[PDB]
Amino acid sequence: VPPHSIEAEQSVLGGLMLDNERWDDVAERVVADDFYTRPHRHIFTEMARLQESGSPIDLITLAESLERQGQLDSVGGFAYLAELSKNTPSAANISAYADIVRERAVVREMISVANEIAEAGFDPQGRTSEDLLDLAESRVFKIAESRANKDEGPKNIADVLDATVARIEQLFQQPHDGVTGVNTGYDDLNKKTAGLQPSDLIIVAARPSMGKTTFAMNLVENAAMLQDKPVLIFSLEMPSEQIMMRSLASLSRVDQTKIRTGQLDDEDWARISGTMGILLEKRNIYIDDSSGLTPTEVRSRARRIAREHGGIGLIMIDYLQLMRVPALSDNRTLEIAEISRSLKALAKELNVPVVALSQLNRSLEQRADKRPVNSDLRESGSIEQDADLIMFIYRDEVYHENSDLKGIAEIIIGKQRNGPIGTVRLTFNGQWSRFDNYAGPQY
Amino acid sequence: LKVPPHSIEAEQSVLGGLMLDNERWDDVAERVVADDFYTRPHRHIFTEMARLQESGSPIDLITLAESLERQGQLDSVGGFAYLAELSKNTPSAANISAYADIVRERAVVREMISVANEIAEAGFDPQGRTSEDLLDLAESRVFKIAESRANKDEGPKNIADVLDATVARIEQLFQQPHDGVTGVNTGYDDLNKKTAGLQPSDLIIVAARPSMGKTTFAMNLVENAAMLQDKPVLIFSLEMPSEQIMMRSLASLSRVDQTKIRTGQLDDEDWARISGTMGILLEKRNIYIDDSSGLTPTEVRSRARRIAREHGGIGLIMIDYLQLMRVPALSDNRTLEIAEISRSLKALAKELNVPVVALSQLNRSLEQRADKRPVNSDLRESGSIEQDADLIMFIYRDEVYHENSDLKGIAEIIIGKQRNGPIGTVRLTFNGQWSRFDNYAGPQY
Amino acid sequence: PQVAGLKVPPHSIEAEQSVLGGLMLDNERWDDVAERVVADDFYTRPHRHIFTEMARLQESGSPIDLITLAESLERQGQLDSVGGFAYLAELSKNTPSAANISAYADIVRERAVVREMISVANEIAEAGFDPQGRTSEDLLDLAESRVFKIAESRANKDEGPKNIADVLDATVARIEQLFQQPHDGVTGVNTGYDDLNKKTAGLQPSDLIIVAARPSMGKTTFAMNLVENAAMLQDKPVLIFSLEMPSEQIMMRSLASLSRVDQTKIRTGQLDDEDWARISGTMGILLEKRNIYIDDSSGLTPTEVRSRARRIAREHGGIGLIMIDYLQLMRVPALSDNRTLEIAEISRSLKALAKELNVPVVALSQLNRSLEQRADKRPVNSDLRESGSIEQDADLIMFIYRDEVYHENSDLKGIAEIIIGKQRNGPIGTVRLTFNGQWSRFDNYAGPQY
Amino acid sequence: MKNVGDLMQRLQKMMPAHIKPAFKTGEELLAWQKEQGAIRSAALERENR
Ligand SMILES: Nc1ncnc2c1ncn2[C@@H]1O[C@H](COP(=O)(O)OP(=O)(O)O)[C@@H](O)[C@H]1O
Ligand SMILES: Nc1ncnc2c1ncn2[C@@H]1O[C@H](COP(=O)(O)OP(=O)(O)O)[C@@H](O)[C@H]1O
Ligand SMILES: Nc1ncnc2c1ncn2[C@@H]1O[C@H](COP(=O)(O)OP(=O)(O)O)[C@@H](O)[C@H]1O
Ligand SMILES: [Mg+2]
Ligand SMILES: [Mg+2]
Ligand SMILES: [Mg+2]
C-alpha cells in the first residue's frame, strides 16, 4: 500500500471550511499535490484562488462560486461537501494534521520515483546512462519545484540590474528632491540619511524623559500627509485616546492641556478642524493599543493589512521591551535577539521600513559626558548588529538646568549601514510634543 | 449545516437602501461598521460611502463610481455593471435598521467563535508557557468582548473609529464645568493641576523612604475617590491586614487619633463623626479589600476582572509595598521579576481603562548627600519602573531628618516623571496622629 | 496509529499513579501537593475520590497510608468500587522511593488547564453555531462564567478579597469584645513593662518586630524576657528558635530570671533554701501549663520555619508569639553568593509568615560598627546595613543602648535605654530601663521624666 | 457608531461657525509648520545668548 491519511485530510478541509484565518498557516506547509485523491485537490485549488481575493471560503461562497465552473456532484457533491462541516467543530490542530499530510505525501512521491528508477534500470528501452541520469536528477528535483513559494529563488544578474535601472529610471525625470525613499520633512536630516530606505530596520533610543515616542509620532504624522499610502502604530505604552490627542495637538500647534480642559479660541479651532478633516479624507493611519504581543502576532496583523489593500509604507513599534516570546522569558539576551531577527525578516519581507523604539541603561549617568554611544545599551548588541540605522537622542536641559541649550535636541547617529555617521541639531518644545528644524548656526 | 453565519441578503438590502436614501444614514451608522461585513467589496463600498457623505452627500449610483475612479479601483470590486444590480434591488421602506441590528449581532457571534479558536490553538501550542500566563490570555480575551459596546477585540483599528471615542472624551467635558480634572479627582486642589487629574490608563508610583506617609497618602487617595465617585476600588495589602487598614482609613475620615479608638477613651463629639462616616461608607459599598500574603500579578488581574464583572469597570486600585510581590518562576533573579511585574501592571491599567497606584521604596544611598531631595536615580531596581510608569511622586517630609527646622508639619511632594505633561513640586502638610494630609493655603512656591 | 492519537485530550497516568504512590507512602508532603492540585485536576473519578479522602482526612485525621485510609473509605461504601483494595495495593507497591512528587504534580496541573480550556473552546463553538434562537446578551455571560470557573476550581475558598461590611463587622465586634472587659491600654500581648505599652499599645498581632544592638547590650535577654512573660500572661503557646545557643543554657537563664537568682549559684551549687523554694515554684508553674516550645537547631530556612510552625498550629490551638535569635545565621542558600538580597528574602518571608498566621514575630539582629567613630553612639536607623529592608518591612524597631559598656565613669550605671527608631501605628519615643545581669533580666524604672 | 460628516458636525456644536481652516490639504500645512518653526528658532537663539 502507499501511505496516505484520510482523517487529517477531512479535518484540514473542514477546518479551512470553518475558519478562514488559517489559509496562511496551512498553505505555508502544504501543496495541492499532497493529497492522494483528486477531488480534495480541486477543492484546495479553489480555496487558494478565492483566498487570493475572496476571504470567505466556508461552504456557501465555495459551493456557489464553484458552481460556475460546473464541478458540483463531482467531488462528492453537496451533501458530502457538507459532511465536512458535520464533524470537527474545534479544528483542534489544523497545523499538525497539515504537517503529516505533507510528510506522507513526500514519502510516497520519493518511493514512487525510486520504483520508476529501478524499472527503467531493468528496462532501458534503447537508452544511454549519461543521457539517462538527467531524468533521475530532474525527477527528484521536481519535488520542491512543485512547492516553490511563489517563484522565490536565486535571481540572475540581469533581473537585479534591471530592477536597479528601473529605480534610476523612475527617479531621474521626476525632481530629485534629495529623497532616496521615504521622507521626513527635516531637510537637515534627509542629508545624513537620504530617506528612510524602503526595506530597513530603524531604531530610536534614549533615556525616558528625552521624548522619543514624540519623535516617532512626528515621523508617521509627516509621512502620512506626504504620501497617500498606509502606516502602522503599535502603542504598547498608552492607548489610542492619548495618541490621537497628542498627534492632533502636534499638527494644529496647540498644547495638550487646553484641549483636555477646553479654554481654547477660534484661532485654534480652525487649525483643529483643518487637520481633522485633512486626516479624514485619507484614512492612512492604523493604530493598535494592544499590551502583550509576539512577533508572529505582529506579522499576522501586518500581512492582514497588506492583503486587504495595496502595501504599507511604514511601521512604528513603541517601547520594544514589552514584546515577549514567552518561551525564553527565563532569559533576556536570546529574547531580544529573537525580536530583532523577526522584525528584520518582516521588514525585508514586505519591503518596508521599521521604527522600533527602545530604552537605554542608566549606567551612563556615571560618565560626566552623557552623550550616548553604541555601548551603553546592553543587549549583547543584538539589535546593534541587526540594524540598518540607529539614532539616539540627547536633550541637554534635563540634566544641566543652567546649560546654554534650551529646547535643543540633537540626534546622534551611532550606526548607519549605507551612509556615514553624523550628528544633527533639533529643537524640542514639549508643550505640544513636536520637533522642528533648526535654521540656526552650525553643528 | 455548520457555517459562520452571515446574512448576505440583508446586507445588500442595507446597501441599496442607503443608495437611494442618503438621509437615513446616521441612524444606520449607529449600528454598522466596515469590520461588521463579511466580504471585501461591501467594505470598500461602505467606507467610500462614508468618506463621501462627509463632503459629497447626494450620492445614489454614479458619484461612488467616480470617487472609486479618483483612486483607481474600478473592476477591483466587481464594477459598474456589478453595481447596477446593487442599485436596482431593495425597494424597501419600513425595515432597514433591524437588518443592521442582526448583522452586528452576527459579527459578535463570529468574533466569539474566532476567539475560541485562538484559545484552543494556544492550548495545543503553549509555546513555552505556563498555565498562569494562559488563563490570563483566555480571561482577558473574553472580557474584552463582554465589555466594549463597540471597539471589537485585538487587532489594529482605522482612525475614524478612534476619533469617535476621542471626540466623546472631549465632549463629556463640556456637559459640565471643566473642574480642572480630566480623570479622577484626588480632593487636593494643589495637585489636580500639575497632574491634570489621575488619567485613567496609567501606572503610578508613590515612592519614599519608609516613614514619610506614602501608605497614608495612597489610602487617602482611594478614600477620597471612593466618595467622589460611585464605583469600586481595591486595596491590596502585602504590608498589614484589614484591621489596621480600617482603623486608619476610618480615622483619616473622622479626624480622631487612633489612640482614642483601640483604647476607648473617646468622647461624644467623636462618636458624632464616627456614626456619620460609618453610615456613609455602608450606604455606598464601593470599597473592596485584599489582605494577601504573597501575590503574583496574575492573581491580581484575576481578582480585578471578577470585581469588574460584578458591576462596572472599576476606577481605582492601590497596591502596597511592591517589593514583596513574588513569582516563583523567576525566583533565581530579581530584576526580571520587577520587570515582569511592571509589564503586567501596565497592561492591566490599559486593559480595564483605569489607574493604578503601586507604592515602592528607595535605596538609601541618598542618605549621605546632605540635600536628600530624592530624584529618579536613587531608586535602584534596574530602572525598569523608571520607564514603564507614567507618574512618579516622591516625598520629602523634612522634619524627620533635621529636627530644629522651620519646615515642620510639612511634607512636600516632588514629581519626577510625567508622560503626558510637565513636572513640578507641591506642598502639603502632615499630622500623623490621625493620618491624613491636607492642603496648604500658604506662601508662594 | 498516531493520527487518531491527536484528538485525545492530553493526560498523564503514570505521574498520577506515582503521586499517590508517594503520598500513600509518606504524609509529610501533603502541604505542597494540595498547594498545587485539586480533585478535578485528575482525569477520572476513582483517583479523584482517592485524593478527596487523602485531603479530607488530613484536615482532622492526619494518618493516611493504605489501611487507615480504607477503614474510612469503607464507611462511605467505596471499596471494590474505585479500583478496589487489590488494585490500590499496586500504587503502594511500585515507586517505593517517593523520590519526586512535586514535579509529578506540576505536569498534572498543566495538562488539566490545557484540557479544561479546550473542552470549553469546543463547547463555545458548537453553541456559537447552534444558537438555539438565543441572543448575545444571553450568550456571552455564560462564556465569562465558564472561563472564570476554571480559575475558581483551584482557588482556596477563604483567600479572596473581602467586602467592606464584613471587615467592618469584625472591627466593631473587636471593639465590643474589648468594652466587655477592662482595657489596660493593651491591644494584644502584654510584656510586664508598663513604660513600654504606652508608646507601643502592646505587641500587635500581625507584625515583624526587630530588636537590634551591638554584641553585648543584651537583646537576647530582652526577647527571652518577653516570651517568658507572655507565657504566664497567656493560655496560649509560644516558640523559640535558639539558633545562637542550645536548650541547656536557655532554660537555665530563663529559670534563673524567673526566680531572681544568679546562674553562678546553680551550676556551682552554693545556694540557699529560699533559693530552691523560688526554683520549685516557677518550675511547677511552667510544667502545669505546657505553653513553650523550643528548637535548638543549627541552620535554617523560612521554608522549614513555616512547616515547623504550621505543624504546631494544626496540632493544637493558634500560636501567639515567636522569637528568632541572631538572625544572620538563617541561610537561604540560593543567594549566598550575595547577602543583601538574602536578608531581603528572609524579611519578606517572615512578614508573610506572621501575617499568614496573624501572630507577632520578634527577630534579632546586629549593627555594623560604623557608629563607633562618632562619639555619640546612640544608634539610629542609618547604621544597620543589611539591605535596609528590615528598615522597611518592620512594623517596629527597638534598639538598645547601655552606657556602662563604652564608658566606665558613668553617671548612668545599671541603666539600659530603649531607642525606638520606627513605628507603623504608634509614635516613637525612648524608654529607660534598668539592668542587673548576673541573673539576666531587665526591669521597670520608676524614676524621673525624660 | 458615528461616521465622518456626522462626527465633524457633532464636534461643530462646540464652536461658532465661520471658523474655516483655509488649509484644505496637507503639504500647505507642512509649509506653514516649517515657517512657524523657523520663526521660533530665532527667539530661542536670542534667549540662549
Ligand atoms: N504638556 C506638557 N508640557 C511640558 N512638557 C511635556 C508635556 N507633555 C509631555 N511633555 C514632555 O514630553 C516628554 C515625552 O516623553 P515620551 O515621549 O513619553 O518619551 P518616553 O516614551 O521615552 O518616556 C516627557 O518627558 C515630558 O517631559
Ligand atoms: N497614631 C499615630 N501617632 C503618631 N504618629 C503616627 C500614628 N500613626 C502613624 N503615625 C506616623 O505616620 C507615619 C506613617 O508611616 P506609614 O504610613 O507606615 O508609611 P510606610 O507604610 O511607608 O511606613 C509613621 O512614620 C508614623 O510615625
Ligand atoms: N552570669 C552572668 N553574670 C554577669 N553578667 C552576665 C552574665 N551573663 C551575662 N552577663 C552580661 O549580660 C549580657 C547578656 O547579653 P547577651 O545574652 O550576651 O546578649 P547578646 O546575645 O546580644 O550578646 C552579657 O553580654 C554580659 O555582659
Ligand atoms: Mg513612549
Ligand atoms: Mg506602608
Ligand atoms: Mg544572643
XYZ file of C-alpha atoms and ligand atoms in Angstrom, chain A residues 212-213 237 318-319 357, chain B residues 419, ligand 4:
8
model
C 11.306 59.809 21.544
C 7.800 58.414 21.254
C 2.820 52.190 26.060
C 6.769 51.518 20.588
C 8.716 50.546 23.706
C 11.821 52.281 19.848
C 4.342 61.115 30.463
Mg 6.968 56.338 24.836
